[PDB]
Each structure stands twice: as structure tokens, then as C-alpha cells.
């Protein structure tokens, strides 16, 4: 995130970090067993890290759960990134609490001009 601000700790409780030794992508928790992410983030093995704020320091609210299934959209196009969506099944259900929580799927598309919140551990310059 370039030009953003630091989120208040655990104020984005549906945000997860996808880890294969180190952070490489984000995702969103949509029920206790499933994370939605991007298909170009595919790896054969992924550890899902929930409840994170500082991804380098153990703070006490983390849950580290390895993926049991990883399902990319069947019509993903790796050249154009069309259909860039992926579902990750956790090998055990996350424990939902005040710092690990789901985000709702949309009931309709958002109108142009709608203000949204974007978050992640991506590059800041």
C-alpha cells in the first residue's frame, strides 16, 4: 500500500497473510474454513496467518493454519489476469474472535464513487 496509513492493530480482522516461508500475498476470511485470494498467488503449499498486525513479531493473537485445498478459478488467464480469484480451505477451522472475523460477500455491485478500504502488507514505495 503506497500513500496509506498504518491500520489500528487487528482493526481489519478479515485480513490474512499468505506465507510460504515469508509473506507473499494477502487474502480475506469469508467463513471459518475459507479464505478468498487471487489466483496468481497460487502456490502448491500455503500457510494462512490470521490475527496478524506485525507479521515479523509474535504478538499473541495469531493463528497459523496450513491450507488443505487450493482452488483457482477454472477460467483464470495467466497472461491477462482475467478471473484472478482463488479459494483456500484451511486444514482446520479458524477460531473466530474479536481479532479474527469474516467479511460479507456483496449483495450488489458497488457504484462508481463509493469509498472503500484497501489493506495489505505490500510495498509502500
Amino acid at each position: 500500500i503506497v500513500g496509506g496509513y498504518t491500520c489500528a492493530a487487528n482493526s481489519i480482522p478479515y485480513q490474512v497473510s499468505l506465507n510460504s516461508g515469508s509473506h507473499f500475498c494477502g487474502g480475506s476470511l469469508i467463513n471459518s474454513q475459507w479464505v478468498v485470494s487471487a489466483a496468481h498467488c497460487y502456490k502448491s503449499r500455503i500457510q494462512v496467518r490470521l490475527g496478524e498486525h506485525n507479521i515479523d513479531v509474535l504478538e499473541g493473537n495469531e493463528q497459523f493454519i496450513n491450507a488443505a485445498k487450493i482452488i483457482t478459478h477454472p477460467n483464470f488467464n495467466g497472461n491477462t489476469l482475467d478471473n484472478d480469484i482463488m479459494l483456500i480451505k484451511l486444514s482446520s477451522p479458524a477460531t473466530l474472535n474479536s481479532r479474527v472475523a469474516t467479511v460479507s460477500l456483496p449483495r450488489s455491485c458497488a457504484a462508481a464513487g463509493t469509498e472503500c478500504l484497501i489493506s495489505g502488507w505490500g510495498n509502500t514505495k
Binding site: 500500500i1 500513500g3 496509513y5 494477502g26 478468498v36 478471473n83 456483496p106 472503500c116
Partner: protein
């Protein structure tokens, strides 16, 4: 772990959905119906490498997934996001059967 370039702390950004015409104008020939642009045509504020897969949440609803762009925070090159309101049935049916 954040390695060599990523921040340690989760970052946040407020950004608006952009019109489809502005999105196609920024990325001629590259926008499908499964993509939406979110951000600022003046640049300066955007998602970037390491953010892909993460959320764009509007009025409490997941509307975008960080996907791609030309550079980061470049002028007339806003972030391009997977349009989640195209995929609720794929998501629900995949979860229901797996």
C-alpha cells in the same frame, strides 16, 4: 515475515471505485468485465506488490481483490481489482461442495 521490502505493519488506504470508462481509458485493451479500477487517477495512493489477494471492502462488503496495475501509484494507472460481485455464486457453490 516481511523480508527485504515489505512493511511489518498492516497498511490501510481509503480509495473510491472508479467508473468503467475511466478504467478502460487508463488501460486500453486490457480491462475485462471481471475487473474494476479503484484508486486515484492523480496517482500517489494505490496498492502494490505484496498486496495481491487482499481485500477491497466497501460499506462492509468485499467488492475487490488486489490483482494488478502498471507500476504502483502512477498517474492515470489506478489499481485493477478482481470484481467480486461477479463471483458470489462461484464462491458459494465452491465452498458448498468442497
Amino acid at each position: 515475515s516481511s523480508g527485504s521490502s515489505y512493511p511489518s505493519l498492516l497498511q490501510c488506504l481509503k480509495a473510491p471505485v472508479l467508473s468503467d470508462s475511466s478504467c478502460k481509458s487508463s488501460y486500453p485493451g486490457q480491462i475485462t468485465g471481471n475487473m474494476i479500477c479503484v484508486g486515484f487517477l492523480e496517482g500517489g495512493k494505490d496498492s502494490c506488490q505484496g498486496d495481491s489477494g487482499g481485500p477491497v471492502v466497501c460499506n462492509g462488503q468485499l467488492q475487490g481483490i488486489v490483482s494488478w496495475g502498471y507500476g504502483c501509484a502512477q498517474k492515470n494507472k489506478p489499481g485493477v481489482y478482481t470484481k467480486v460481485c461477479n463471483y458470489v455464486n462461484w464462491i458459494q457453490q465452491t465452498i458448498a461442495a468442497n
